[model samples]
Target: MVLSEGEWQLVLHVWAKVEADIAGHGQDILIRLFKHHPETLEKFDRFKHLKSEAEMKASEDLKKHGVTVLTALGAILKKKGHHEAELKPLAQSHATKHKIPIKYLEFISEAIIHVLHSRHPADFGADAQGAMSKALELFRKDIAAKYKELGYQG
Candidate 1:
């Protein structure tokens, strides 16, 4: 999936402010993810035992993990052609250690799309949304390729 130049411009416009936005609301995004897909919490050993949303939100581990993911996504946008440098190790660990399925990656992308829309509804119109979708699809494809190479069918 290729993004047009205008799409790329929109991506950078939103992404330029992403780091700060993620820092402030990253945990909330994760909370939304776990709430939207409760089964996903089971994949995280740090969160699996948590019994409440408040507990999940309060956990430092959860917050840190959220930041890690958002930062990696920012790197993908900021680093341009160097996405593999950020995505490869993450795919390796996620597939081997966490055993995270591809669905969770999809969930993450959807969660971010929702968050972006909620935070900046007017700015996140069709073009911006399409840009994000294309970028995330590309990222997902790269990660899935690594997963396949590692023999992870999921």
Candidate 2:
């Protein structure tokens, strides 16, 4: 899907931030959201656990010959975390599994964030948005470079 340049930028930035936010929740939101939306839990488990493990592990094994480790918020918290190699697979599978259109991935990213912000409005006010935007840009650069290396002209 062809996102406008600005849209693509926002999507990339928000994608990383959403991942970080989810990690920070440390499963709290998962529990609560599951309580209200049990079906979501099944999808979440499939996405985060089953699919992520197999795909990410294969990527890791490939990296033994100098492949990239898709970065996540937890990975970024670790020393030397850069662009996540997992974004492509994670985003792709998430789109497929959820039946979300590829073009709407950014919306998916933002929606996850909005849910958190709604739950913690004070914590996710302007300052938080600014911080997320800044950190997200850093990840975006990393993602752009990785995609380029992989011959993704988009």
Candidate 3:
């Protein structure tokens, strides 16, 4: 699915800020992801065993992981042409190795929209929220495709 040119205008506007502080964005996305879907922590050996919010929040490993995921999303937005190159490998790991459900992808994208909306309320109003939310939907759909093809058929 293609985003309308107007949606791109809105999404890209906030996306630049997302890239500007991707570390924080990624960090909060995961924090809220776990907050929203506590069961998902089981998939993360790095974070699963953590005993407290403080520990998870301060985790350098979690920070790095968040940065990695946020960057992959940003890369797809910045370089749409190379998405196929980044696409299959990501779903392969999530499907075959991570063994996560397709629903987990929604958790992450939902966390992303909330993170952006919460942190940048002035810049991220209702219209931008809908636009950015749709942008991430496209991202999730692409990644979800490879999941189905690889091993997440259910």
RMSD of each: 1.9, 11.2, 1.8
Residue-level lDDT tens digits of model 2 in 1-154: 2233444444444445545544334333333333444444344444344243235334432233111122344354222233255456543444344443322323333434555576567556564555444444444455445445554442
Residue pairs clashing in model 3 are none
What's the count of clashing pairs in each model shown?
Answer: 0, 5, 0
What lDDT is reached at residue 44 by model 3? 85
Arranged by TM-score with the best first, the candidates are: 3, 1, 2
Looking at model 2, the pairs that clash are 63-67, 70-85, 70-86, 71-84, 71-85
**Sorted on lDDT, highest at the top, how do the candidates line up?**
3, 1, 2
Tally clashing residue pairs in candidate 1: 0
lDDT of 1 by residue, 1-154 (tens): 2566677777878876666567556887898899899988788766788778888778888888888888877878765444778888888998999898888989988988888888888777888888888888888888899999999976
Better of 1 and 3 by TM-score: 3
Per-prediction TM-score, please? 0.88, 0.39, 0.90
Which stretches in model 2 have alpha-carbon errors above 4 Å? 1-71, 77-108
Weakest ten-residue segment in model 2 by summed lDDT = 61-70
Candidate 3's TM-score reads 0.90
Candidate that beats the other on TM-score, 2 or 3, i.e. the better one: 3
* Candidate 3 deviant stretches above 4 angstroms: 80-82
Candidate 2 TM-score, true structure as reference = 0.39
Off by over 4 Å in 1: none
Report model 1's TM-score to 2 decimal places. Answer: 0.88
